Amino acid sequence: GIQGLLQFIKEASEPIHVRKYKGQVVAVDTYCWLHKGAIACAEKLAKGEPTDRYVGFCMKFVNMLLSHGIKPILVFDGCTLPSKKEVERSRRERRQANLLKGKQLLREGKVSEARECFTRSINITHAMAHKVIKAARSQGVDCLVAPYEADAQLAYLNKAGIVQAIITEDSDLLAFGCKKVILKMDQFGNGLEIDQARLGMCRQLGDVFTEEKFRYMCILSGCDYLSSLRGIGLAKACKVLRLANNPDIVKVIKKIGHYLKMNITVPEDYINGFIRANNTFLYQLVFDPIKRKLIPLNAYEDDVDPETLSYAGQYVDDSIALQIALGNKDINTFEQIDDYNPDTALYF
DNA sequence: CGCTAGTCGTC
DNA sequence: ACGACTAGCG
Ligand SMILES: Cc1cc(Cl)cnc1N1CN([C@@H](C)c2ccccc2)C(=O)c2c(O)c(=O)ccn21
Ligand SMILES: [Mg+2]
Ligand SMILES: [Mg+2]
Ligand code: NA
The missing domain is CATH 1.10.150.20 (5' to 3' exonuclease, C-terminal subdomain)
Structure with missing residues (x-):
């Protein structure tokens, strides 16, 4: 997120209902939905008990978009960028320390405080994402795991014309150059739309x-x-x-x-x-799902050299990028966890 | 005073 | 990994 961006450009925002996108395509920053879903079953997820409540949570939002005639494309985060590996490991350490703090709180009789603690102790795994992928695919909903950040993949889908708006809680999508971003969307379809064309309405921007x-x-x-x-x-x-x-x-x-x-x-x-x-x-790096190729978000310009840009994502073979995109290849282990093939049945 | 960042409550 | 809100800084 870009701290304060939404309030800074308040004049480019307008309240909408997703009905506005009936007959159109919308891409979703699905880890935002997996997160809220995982909070609703955090005590079971942190301890280790089996649960699928987070799947029902995401599908409630998917089924709401479908009821209004919207074709949703669920995008998922993929591999971590090299520069974010210390951050992702530091996040795991804080989540495991919050699990211990929550256990301590339950022992002291502080049940409500422990239940809050557990919500900050959950890891969103590729296995959790894959369950949502399977549930969405049975409903005819296209899913795509970004090679790296879903932010870049979503920006690609919007810049390319495949999707007309991005549903997300992250204002980074505006910085990436998305034309239409739907923030704060609730289970009923009410949200705040920011249009890049209206940035000129903001007196603060000049x-x-x-x-x-x-x-x-x-x-x-x-x-x-x-x-x-x-x-x-x-x-x-x-x-x-x-x-x-x-x-x-x-x-x-x-x-x-x-x-x-x-x-x-x-x-x-x-x-x-x-x-x-x-x-x-x-x-x-993002994945073009039509041509099934791993490409940079924008074509390289004069002042850069692609060989210096490993921090923006390492290339892998297109066939490996395709197995990641379909959800078949685990983003953490690189193991093949599924065998989905779009041919024998977005990727067309 | 405008603005930024540290604190606190929650999803 | 958010936002509200206010203290307190330049
Ligand atoms: C760790 C984290 C928690 C929350 Cl609530 C939000 N973002 C998180 N992270 C990680 N993440 C995804 C994998 C992700 C999103 C949600 C949950 C887990 C992972 C992101 O998408 C991301 C961003 O794009 C950003 O600009 C800042 C921070 N994050
Ligand atoms: Mg993101
Ligand atoms: Mg982001
Ligand atoms: Na800042």
Whole structure:
């Protein structure tokens, strides 16, 4: 997520009901739904008892979209990016410590506090995702596991024209350049739609409404690939890009303290991390499910070299990318857990 | 005062 | 891994 982005661009948002997309295609950031579902059966998931309540949760939202004539494409996160492996292991450690804290709370009679604890102790596994995939496939619902982040895969589906809107709780999708993003959608279909075309309605953005400048602002403000410099949020990131007249973002960032009248010494690792974050939003690997090929989100541009971009996702053979996309190949172990083949029955 | 970030409650 | 909200900083 980009902290505060939704409130900063409030004027580009409008309340909608998903009926608006009747006869259209919509891609879903399914781990958001798996998460809410896993909270509803957290005591069983953390301890180790078998449960499928999270499956019923996701299918309630899938069945609501289908009732309104919407063709949903459920996208799932895949492999972790190299730069996020310490983060994903640190998350496992906090979830296991919250499981121990919850057990301790139940022993002290604090049942309500322990039940809360368990909700922050759950791991969303590929095996949980695969159960949702199977349930959705029986209903005729297409599923796709992104090679890496679902954010990039979803942005690809929308930029390519396959889907007309992205349902997600993550404002990163706006930074990736999605045209229509549906945030805060409830089980009944009510939600907040942000349209990229309406970014011009936001007086706070000024001229920071182009895809390039908007992405730069989101990165400078603090993003999932790079924390901000201290004292920098959306208002100051936007102010810097508004005041600067220069195509080169690297020169602008070095001069950041001057534009804001702040004491900012820009570290060496900040400039490099910025270029890496920018390259991740631009060139992260996604899967074209029609041609069944692993490709970068955008075609490579003049100032980059693909061999330096392992942090944006490593290439694997197209056949391996296809087994991952169908849900047949476990994202953590690389074991073949299923044999689904779309031919012998999105991928057409 | 505008803004950012630390605290706290919950999904 | 959220947001609300306010203290407290520049
Ligand atoms: C660890 C985590 C928890 C929650 Cl509530 C939300 N996001 C989480 N993570 C991980 N994740 C997926 C795998 C994922 C989403 C939901 C649950 C587990 C994994 C993401 O999609 C993701 C982002 O895109 C982002 O910008 C920041 C953080 N996360
Ligand atoms: Mg994501
Ligand atoms: Mg994200
Ligand atoms: Na920030």
